[PDB]
Design a protein around this ligand. Structure first.
Ligand SMILES: [Cl-]
Ligand SMILES: [Mg+2]
Lengths: 111, 241, 243, 250, 240, 231, 195, 235, 244
């Protein structure tokens, strides 16, 4: 039987300061006991001073980030170049994820 | 007067769009003829290449529908090709579904039924063509069946179509009144083609070169068209007797 | 009367006046030609320079279908593009199913049946272009010309648009004076001359020449545009013949 | 490339007339004469084979058509319209009856199905009515022999005898004088040939006349033996020779 | 499907199919609505061209939409059935999802919305119907009376009339109905409704139908003899 | 006359009147200018107001980081067509990781407009567009007409009185094409070009709308006090 | 939902239905009315899968109430039971069937007779002098086979019902938290508040 | 007959231009934007004295921060209001914020040209959409059935519009208070109305940042009418 | 396109009438007269055939009177083919109701359904209406004996006695003159035939011109019987009443 999911490993970490925030991730990408890459970027600048990472199954992670980046682009077009606030970005991501409730994106996301 | 624009009845019980489609039939100014031998069915048609810039090999109104069935069209070439493509598809589909080659008369019926639908349904126009189907059918033998824009069809001992059809028709009628048989009593198809060309020459009153004619021949298990050189051989034999 | 108001209506003559009106749009357009040569075909077109502000060599009119077929047209330019887009879909589905690239006669009927279908209903308008097209297949070179009715034939030479009579006369001389045939490089030169001679009908505005060709020897049976030195050589030959 | 004719092409005019139906009936009037006569032990239907050319083989054009083994049909009006109606009538006899009940429909119900198809062409979007009137003769076990007329409106009526098309007014008068309730089938064929001679101009013989009967069961025409209940078709088309024999005793 | 735009604008900014639907309402039999202090009465005309009728089984002019709301109308009878059915279905659907019967305003807004939709949908003509919708909201003793028309506009009325010669009865009501003090009792309200119909009807009691709606789903239709008593009392007072 | 009821009907001289009537809506629209050098491409647009209380209707729309247009005619049709361009630019990026070529963008608009001119029920688009962009083959300017005809140009103008600006650009052709690596001088030439189409009214701070795209310049729109520099 | 009982006597139909609603480990409610009035003289009790039971009951209720307004008339119990059966028989061959069993108790005002219909989730309808769904019938039918007579009064019917409930309280493992009892007769539907 | 989406020879859509004529026949609606808020007022225009005027709903809430007034075929506005409300609530669901006034207006205007042979004709109603957001502050928009919308400092629509607009031309300045704007709407409504202006045949409303969108009571509007009469009599 | 040829069958005139409905009613006014009379102990349906020919097979013929179920019958005026489309739909609706509720359909519910179908053709779809008017004769246990009529508009009404088709003005005056509420079936039979005998455009009323039917609750042991009269039985009732 075909299994549509996989595990690319990796680990990510977000910490919020007083007037700053960090999002950190390791650059290793794996399947089973093989190393696929020693440097495969996992944390992405998405515009509007928002950083994102969707760790887990890398194909679903890339797909989600790609869709959110696009969501930011279309938010600018549809609302007069207004800055997407972090709270608004978060609610948008909930709808992106819950849209595939019965065939999920296999990731843990931090912004 | 919108009863003349679409296929609905006029007060006289007429369909004017069907009648006007019949007039489109003669727009090419070409005459066709079909006759039956013992073992064969021959169809001849005038070929006119007015422009010197035309490739004469591509100018044709005879179509190979299937291996057994040929079709000559009287009418404009776009509608002729529309009808040809559909007949080809219908003949192939018939073979696939029912496991034997579509008979000439059955294809004629099918194409006539399609033509009938265009006379009853408003959104579809009639095709401005007359379709003469020919074969040597495995059950019925040599066969000529002809369809028109009314959706009418019938079998023929021989037939003619075009501007000067009546002159050809009466010429053929008078031959069969003498012989008292439904066909050309001749063994080879070559001599049946010679008969067809000869009686068209007599009826139209014009001589023909190799490039003025176009010929199709149906035998048992194949239909084929003659080349210019094959026709020339036919024209030489007519002149020599 | 009223027979010319709706597409697909036969007049009492047996004519479709809407198709004949589409031909008038074609007659109004710029001149385009086709020349069948020994091992291929050449296409050429007149591009009117409406303004100095037009960028030279940029507004390309001749279009490729698959990799072996060239298409040029006169009339409503968007209608021509729509027809080529369909031609590309037809060529793709043929190649997908049958593997071999679409033969030129096969491709000619695909366009022909599609144009003819736009004369069957009142819900659509006929095509406002005549399209000259062709290329090289397994059986050799083929040139075709397709009208708004869906009517098409094979040609030794073809011409359409405002300068068609002038062009047709010149093409007829080439057929008589070269029965054994014309070479591909000769046909490019002659194509340039014929467009320049046909420009006397559109003589108010100056123009830009555009040529393309498919030839078994000169392009490996693929459609290519004539560019650079070979284009300038054909322009010089054309300029010399008018003077 | 759209069918945009979703509206009726047959509508009521101010006078209450449905124009297209009337005009279809006019097309039927121009058509060649056909008739039907019902006997005690059978029914006969008949018409002229009006050949469009003497080169044409009129045997190939069948104006009188088998619908089921016990039901036959003839028409007056537009031949192509009739041909497609015969195709649809044969099919609906199977789909809406034989494939449900395992037997052929009775005459009246097959007539009803044909009538329905003709009504729909009088109301549905983007179509004209059928330009034919049909005469349908048939037999079934519980109703016996019957003869029905069907018009472009979809309306149908049962007849003892009638005629439609070109010379129908004269032909109907001729039948009123000759018809009685004690007629044998041979007497009805004789009367059919006499009535039809009046409306024909040219040649009058087995090759120019098409005639069929609904009569006794024909086990010889069945094509197989071994099932006692299946006794054969009651529909039979008379041959060219069989017609000429009766024309000598005319 | 049949997509043709039948309701469209004309150069002067009118939608003729909507305005011609109002003419169908003008042709229809007269209907009147009067609300009292603790009731609403719906009066309706029955044209006496039709005798030999069976009054048991003939469709009555006032229709219950739910146990607490009624709908009368003027215009095409066949069209009215379609609106009544849709309204009845929506009334049960509202009870099912909201667990509360419809308000009179809500039911009116729904019927009005259906009417509007038929003025800008392809392949359809407007309803040739105007309605009077009357009743009491759940657990409420304030009377409600609304009117709708083919365009889809709706509004609330102290009293209102629609249909043939509605101009005349509206004239009568405009002078006889006082807002500061409406018909205090059922008797007073029915009397004013019958009086207003007697301006147009021009016949005794067979041509008038009355339906009284009270709070808490108390709807009753008056008989011929009960109405005929009101007709007798009005004309005896008039002879003076 | 009898042949202008719908877009599916040719006239006896081979004309499509509904398309020509749509073309007329552009001439009624406010003037907009387009021009380019080898490095940059500029749009300049005269915005129109309803009255003194109203705002000035926006003329310029961004399609991608490297492409956008100015409109003249029916603004809602410009919104439909610009949205289509936004999607096609976006499809190119997501599927092929490729910025859409300006020439290919023009071809897509042409084909979209064409379908409305050949089928019954629909109408032609009632707007003209000037598309600017910077792609892998440098700066580009396109003119779109709703007949379907799309044209690549060094400069142009569309709208009411647009012939004045178009003549100026035809004279200035040799000068402004050479303005490389100098955005302010290229805008100056565009502002001077649009001035040739003005009568009575002059260029004020909330009247003028400018856009630019180039080598190391994303598609950006300048309105308000940002264009006071160029008045 | 667990126990639903019905008994048809001389001049009435009595329905008894348990009050407990249990999810897994906990009894969430002990006062649940497992019934809907379909019309003034017709009552339907129900039991089966969570959610499905109420959704189906209220759907039937809405449809019968719609019919009542449209015709200004009350459908006979027989007619309501046939409508309900068809809805369940349609349901059983659906993507997701209604897992609901019902009893319909009605007084036919035309015939002046009480009527009790038992219908299961498959659409299996039977008219009975007494009925039960689920495990209840394993205890209660034998009792009613012994003690029932057709000419019993409503009070005798209630005593016979107490004897059923006592037996179920003695021998069934689940605590069903007593029953709500409702009587359907010529005067309509009323609830026996003390049982 | 002729197509519904047909262009005239001047380059205008016939049906859109004809719908604008329907809007001229409608009752007057006026909007005035200030730095303290946006005021929206309408003529009710009851067809008869028996019609209960409080049931005439020509001013309508879309969200807490966005109000709307209408003029023309007011039945056509219901589906436009329904779309606006859904668009406002849906955007809050997707983005956890109030939706911009311009974006809401744009969404309503996208419906406008969705007609052909979709709905069978354009809308026969114009809207004044008034609101507040954090980015562009207090705003007033005029939404037409052409699909076009203009922002306005002040705007009148309906039967008295050209007369009212000329008056708004003179009277409006950037320093107007909310109280001043209320009186100014009442003044101009009284001028263009056929019947004499009072609390029962005219209705006021406003939208402020603090209190959101509020339709004014008849008792509150009555006092503002009395205040207007006195200040006009004062000189 | 196709718009050019659209008659627009579902529009209002300036006066607020439906063109096609009015013109359909004009068609129906030329059709053979049908009369329905309701008595205390039954209903009569009488109707005049249009096509007198001696060669028409009458005993197997049916143009006017059709059975919908055992309790309900209809008399037709208008296009017979149109009526048969509607009749078969009504037969199906009756059996759908019987399948669902296990009770015979009430008469009004069947009438409303058919009338709603007719209404639909006047408001949407762009098709011509059905050129048919029905007289419904039926019985149920709620209202007992009922007579209704419907017309192409989809409007329906109930009647004690009614006529449709030709000469309805004249027919309705005669019925209004002689009808009484305490009347019986045998008397109603006589009234129906006398009314046709005076309104008919023919020279004389004969058995071969009529279709006749009764619905009586005068069957064995309190049931309801539908009798469609045979030709000989129509001939007998014509002699009995004293018309021939
Ligand atoms: Cl077929
Ligand atoms: Mg047609």
């Amino acid at each position: 039987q075909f299994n549509p999911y996989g595990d690319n490993g990796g680990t990510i970490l977000g910490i919020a300061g007083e007037d700053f925030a960090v999002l950190a991730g390791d650059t290793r990408n794996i399947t089973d006991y093989s190393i696929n890459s020693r440097y495969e970027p996992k944390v992405f600048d998405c515009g509007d001073n928002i950083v994102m990472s969707a760790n887990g199954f890398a194909a679903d992670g890339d797909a989600l980030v790609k869709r959110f980046k696009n969501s930011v682009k279309w938010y600018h077009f549809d609302h007069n170049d207004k800055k997407l606030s972090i709270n608004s970005a978060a609610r948008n991501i909930q709808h992106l994820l819950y849209g595939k409730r019965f065939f999920p994106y296999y990731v843990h996301t931090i912004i | 007067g919108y009863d003349r624009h679409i296929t609905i009845f006029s007060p006289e019980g007429r369909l004017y769009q069907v009648e006007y489609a019949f007039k489109a039939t003669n727009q090419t100014n070409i005459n066709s003829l079909a006759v039956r031998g013992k073992d064969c069915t021959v169809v001849i048609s005038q070929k006119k290449v007015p422009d010197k810039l035309l490739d004469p090999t591509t100018v044709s109104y005879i179509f190979c529908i299937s291996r057994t069935i040929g079709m000559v069209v009287n009418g404009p070439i776009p509608d002729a090709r529309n009808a040809a493509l559909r007949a080809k598809a219908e003949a192939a589909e018939f073979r696939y579904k029912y496991g034997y080659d579509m008979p000439c008369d059955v294809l004629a019926k099918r194409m006539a039924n399609l033509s009938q639908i265009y006379t009853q349904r408003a959104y579809m126009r009639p095709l401005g063509v007359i379709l003469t189907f020919v074969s040597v059918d495995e059950e019925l033998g040599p066969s000529i069946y002809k369809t028109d824009p009314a959706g009418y069809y019938v079998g023929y001992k021989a037939t003619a179509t075009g501007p000067k059809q009546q002159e050809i028709t009466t010429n053929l009628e008078n031959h069969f009144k003498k012989s008292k048989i439904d066909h050309i009593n001749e063994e080879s198809w070559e001599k049946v083609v010679e008969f067809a060309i000869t009686h068209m020459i007599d009826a139209l009153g014009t001589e023909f070169s190799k490039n003025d004619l176009e010929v199709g021949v149906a035998t048992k298990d194949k239909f084929f068209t003659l080349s210019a050189e094959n026709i020339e051989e036919r024209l030489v034999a007519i002149a020599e007797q | 009367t009223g027979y010319d108001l709706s597409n697909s209506v036969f007049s009492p003559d047996g004519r479709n006046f809407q198709v004949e009106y589409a031909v008038k749009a074609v007659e109004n357009g710029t001149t385009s030609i086709g020349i069948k040569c020994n091992d291929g075909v050449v296409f050429a077109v007149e591009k009117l320079i409406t303004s100095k502000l037009l960028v030279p060599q940029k507004n390309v009119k001749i279009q490729v279908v698959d990799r072996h077929i060239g298409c040029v047209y006169s009339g409503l330019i968007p209608d021509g593009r729509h027809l080529v887009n369909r031609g590309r879909e037809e060529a793709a589905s043929f190649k997908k199913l049958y593997k071999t690239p679409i033969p030129i006669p096969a491709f000619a009927d695909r366009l022909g049946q599609y144009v003819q279908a736009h004369t069957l209903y009142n819900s659509v308008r006929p095509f406002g272009v005549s399209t000259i097209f062709g290329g090289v297949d397994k059986n050799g070179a083929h040139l075709y010309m397709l009208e708004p009715s869906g009517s098409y034939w094979g040609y030794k030479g073809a011409a359409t648009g405002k300068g068609r009579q002038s062009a047709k006369a010149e093409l007829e001389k080439l057929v008589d004076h070269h029965p054994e045939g014309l070479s591909a490089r000769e046909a490019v030169k002659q194509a340039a001359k014929i467009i320049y001679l046909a420009h006397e009908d559109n003589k108010e505005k100056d123009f830009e020449l555009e040529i393309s060709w498919c030839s078994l020897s000169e392009t490996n049976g693929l459609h290519k545009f004539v560019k650079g030195d070979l284009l300038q050589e054909a322009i010089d030959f054309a300029q010399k013949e008018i003077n | 490339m759209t069918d945009r004719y979703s509206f009726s092409l047959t509508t009521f005019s101010p006078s209450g007339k449905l124009g297209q139906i009337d005009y279809a009936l006019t097309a039927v009037k121009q058509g060649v004469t056909s008739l039907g006569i019902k006997a005690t032990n059978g029914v006969v239907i008949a018409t002229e084979k009006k050949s469009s050319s003497p080169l044409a083989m009129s045997e190939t054009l069948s104006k009188v058509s088998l619908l089921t083994p016990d039901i036959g049909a003839v028409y007056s009006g537009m031949g192509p319209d009739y041909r497609v109606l015969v195709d649809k009538s044969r099919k609906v006899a199977h789909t809406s009856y034989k494939r449900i009940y395992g037997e052929y429909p009775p005459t009246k119900l097959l007539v009803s199905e044909v009538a329905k198809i003709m009504q729909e062409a009088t109301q549905s979007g983007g179509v004209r009515p059928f330009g034919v009137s049909l005469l349908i003769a048939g037999h079934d076990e519980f109703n016996g022999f019957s003869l029905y007329q069907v018009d472009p409106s979809g309306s149908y009526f049962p007849w003892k005898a009638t005629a439609i098309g070109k010379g129908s007014v004269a032909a109907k008068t001729f039948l009123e004088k000759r018809w009685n309730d004690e007629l044998e089938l041979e007497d009805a064929i004789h009367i059919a040939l006499l009535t039809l001679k009046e409306s024909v101009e040219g040649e009058f013989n087995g090759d120019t006349i098409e005639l069929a009967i609904i009569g006794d069961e024909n086990p010889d025409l069945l094509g197989y033996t071994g099932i006692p209940t299946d006794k054969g078709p009651r529909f039979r088309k008379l041959t060219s020779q069989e017609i000429n024999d009766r024309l000598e005793a005319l | 499907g049949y997509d043709r735009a039948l309701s469209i604008f004309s150069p002067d900014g009118h939608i003729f199919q909507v305005e011609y639907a109002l003419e169908a309402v003008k042709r229809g039999t007269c209907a009147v609505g009067v609300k009292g202090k603790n009731c609403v009465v719906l009066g309706c005309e029955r044209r006496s061209t039709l005798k030999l009728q069976d009054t048991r089984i003939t469709p009555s002019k006032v229709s219950k939409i739910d146990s607490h709301v009624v709908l009368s109308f003027s215009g095409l009878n066949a069209d009215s059935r379609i609106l009544i059915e849709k309204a009845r279905v929506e009334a049960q659907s509202h009870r099912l999802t909201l667990e509360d019967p419809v308000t009179v305003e809500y039911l009116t807004r729904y019927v009005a919305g259906v009417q509007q939709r038929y003025t800008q949908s392809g392949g359809v003509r407007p309803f040739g119907v105007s309605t009077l919708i009357a009743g009491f909201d759940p657990r409420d003793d304030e009377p409600k009376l609304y009117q709708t028309e083919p365009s889809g506009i709706y509004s609330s009325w102290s009293a209102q009339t629609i249909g043939r010669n509605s101009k005349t009865v509206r004239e009568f009501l405009e002078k006889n109905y006082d807002r500061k003090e409406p018909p205090a009792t059922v008797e007073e309200c029915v009397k004013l409704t019958v009086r207003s119909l007697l301006e147009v009807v021009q016949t005794g009691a067979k041509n008038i139908e009355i339906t009284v709606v009270k709070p808490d789903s108390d709807i009753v239709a008056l008989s011929s003899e009960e109405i005929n008593q009101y007709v007798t009392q009005i004309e005896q007072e008039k002879q003076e | 006359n009898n042949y202008d009821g719908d877009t599916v009907t040719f006239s006896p001289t081979g004309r499509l009147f509904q398309v020509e009537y749509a073309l007329e809506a552009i001439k009624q629209g406010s003037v907009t200018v387009g021009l380019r050098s080898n490095t940059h491409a500029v749009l300049v647009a005269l915005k129109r107001n309803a009255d003194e209380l109203s705002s000035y209707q926006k003329k310029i729309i961004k399609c991608d980081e490297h492409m956008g247009l100015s409109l003249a005619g029916l603004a809602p049709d410009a919104r439909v067509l610009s949205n289509y361009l936004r999607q096609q630019c976006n499809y190119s990026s997501l599927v092929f990781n490729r910025k859409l070529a300006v020439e290919r963008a023009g071809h897509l608009l042409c084909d979209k407009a064409q379908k409305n001119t050949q089928s019954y029920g629909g109408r032609p688009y009632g707007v003209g567009l000037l598309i600017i962009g910077y792609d892998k083959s440098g700066a580009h300017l396109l003119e779109f007409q709703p007949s379907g005809n799309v044209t690549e140009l060094y400069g142009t103008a569309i709208g009411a009185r647009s012939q004045g600006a178009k003549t100026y650009l035809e004279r200035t052709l040799d000068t402004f094409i050479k303005i490389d690596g100098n955005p302010d001088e290229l805008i100056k030439a565009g502002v001077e070009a649009i001035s040739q189409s003005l009568r009575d009214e002059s260029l004020t701070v909330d009247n003028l709308s400018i856009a630019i795209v180039g080598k190391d310049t994303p598609f950006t729109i300048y309105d308000g006090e940002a264009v006071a520099k160029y008045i | 939902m667990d126990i639903i009982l019905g008994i048809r006597v001389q001049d009435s139909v009595i329905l008894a239905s348990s009050k407990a609603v249990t999810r897994g480990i906990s009894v969430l409610k002990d006062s649940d009315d497992k019934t809907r009035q379909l019309s003034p003289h017709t009552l339907m009790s129900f039991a089966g899968e969570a959610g499905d039971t109420v959704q189906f009951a209220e759907y039937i209720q809405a449809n019968i109430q719609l019919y009542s307004i449209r015709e200004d008339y009350e459908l006979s119990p027989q007619a309501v039971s046939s409508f309900v059966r068809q809805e369940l028989a349609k349901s059983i061959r659906s993507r997701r069937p209604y897992q609901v069993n019902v009893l319909i108790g009605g007084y036919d005002k035309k015939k002046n007779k009480p009527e009790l219909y038992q219908i299961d989730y498959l659409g299996t309808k039977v008219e009975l002098p007494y009925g039960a769904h689920g495990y209840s019938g394993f205890y209660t039918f034998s009792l009613l086979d012994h003690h029932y007579r057709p000419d019993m009064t409503t009070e005798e019917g209630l005593d016979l019902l107490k004897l059923c409930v006592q037996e179920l309280e003695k021998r069934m493992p689940m605590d069903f938290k007593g029953v709500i009892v409702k009587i359907v007769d010529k005067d309509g539907i009323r609830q026996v508040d003390d049982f | 007959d002729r197509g519904v989406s047909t262009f005239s020879p001047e380059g205008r859509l016939f049906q859109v231009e004809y719908s604008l004529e329907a809007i001229k026949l409608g009752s007057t609606a006026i909007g005035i934007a200030t730095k303290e808020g946006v005021v929206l007022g309408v003529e009710k225009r009851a067809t008869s004295p028996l019609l209960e005027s409080d049931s005439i709903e020509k001013i309508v809430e879309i969200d807490r921060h966005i109000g709307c007034a209408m003029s023309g075929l007011t039945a056509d506005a219901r589906s436009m209001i329904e779309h606006a409300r859904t668009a406002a609530v849906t955007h809050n669901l997707y983005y956890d914020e109030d939706i911009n006034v311009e974006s809401l207006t744009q969404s309503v205007c996208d419906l406008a040209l969705r007609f052909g042979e979709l709905m069978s004709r354009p809308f026969g109603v114009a809207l004044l959409i008034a609101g507040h957001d954090a980015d562009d502050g207090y705003q007033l928009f005029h939404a037409e059935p052409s699909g076009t919308f203009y922002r306005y400092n002040a705007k009148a629509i309906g039967s008295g519009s050209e007369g009212a607009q000329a008056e708004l031309l003179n009277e409006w300045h950037s320093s107007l208070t909310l109280k001043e704007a209320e009186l100014l709407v009442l003044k101009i409504l009284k001028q263009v109305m056929e019947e004499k202006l009072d609390e029962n045949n005219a209705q006021l409303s406003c939208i402020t940042k603090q209190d959101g969108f509020k339709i004014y009571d008849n008792e509150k509007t009555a006092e503002l009418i009395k205040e207007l009469k006195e200040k006009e009599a004062a000189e | 396109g196709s718009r050019r040829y659209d008659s627009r069958t579902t529009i209002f005139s300036p006066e607020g009438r439906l063109y096609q409905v009015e013109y359909a009613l004009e068609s129906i006014s030329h059709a053979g007269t049908a009369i329905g009379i309701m008595a205390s102990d039954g209903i009569v349906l009488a109707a005049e055939r249009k096509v007198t020919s001696t060669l028409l097979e009458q005993d197997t013929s049916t143009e006017k009177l059709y059975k919908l179920n055992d309790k309900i019958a209809v008399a037709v005026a208008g296009l017979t083919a149109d009526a048969e489309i509607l009749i078969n739909t009504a037969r199906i609706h009756a059996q759908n109701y019987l399948k669902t509720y296990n009770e015979d359909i009430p008469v009004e519910i069947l009438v409303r359904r058919l009338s709603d179908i007719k209404q639909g053709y006047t408001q949407h779809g762009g098709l011509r209406p059905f050129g048919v008017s029905f007289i419904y004769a039926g019985y149920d246990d709620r209202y007992g004996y009922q007579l209704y009529t419907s017309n192409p508009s989809g409007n329906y009404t109930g009647w004690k006695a009614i006529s449709v088709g030709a000469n309805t003005s004249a027919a309705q005056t005669l019925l209004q003159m002689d009808y009484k509420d305490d009347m019986k079936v045998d008397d109603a039979i006589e009234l129906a035939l006398k009314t046709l005998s005076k309104t008919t455009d023919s020279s004389a009323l004969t058995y071969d011109r009529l279709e006749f039917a009764t619905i009586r609750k005068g069957a064995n042991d309190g049931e309801v019987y539908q009798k469609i009269f045979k030709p000989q039985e129509i001939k007998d009732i014509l002699v009995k009443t004293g018309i021939t």
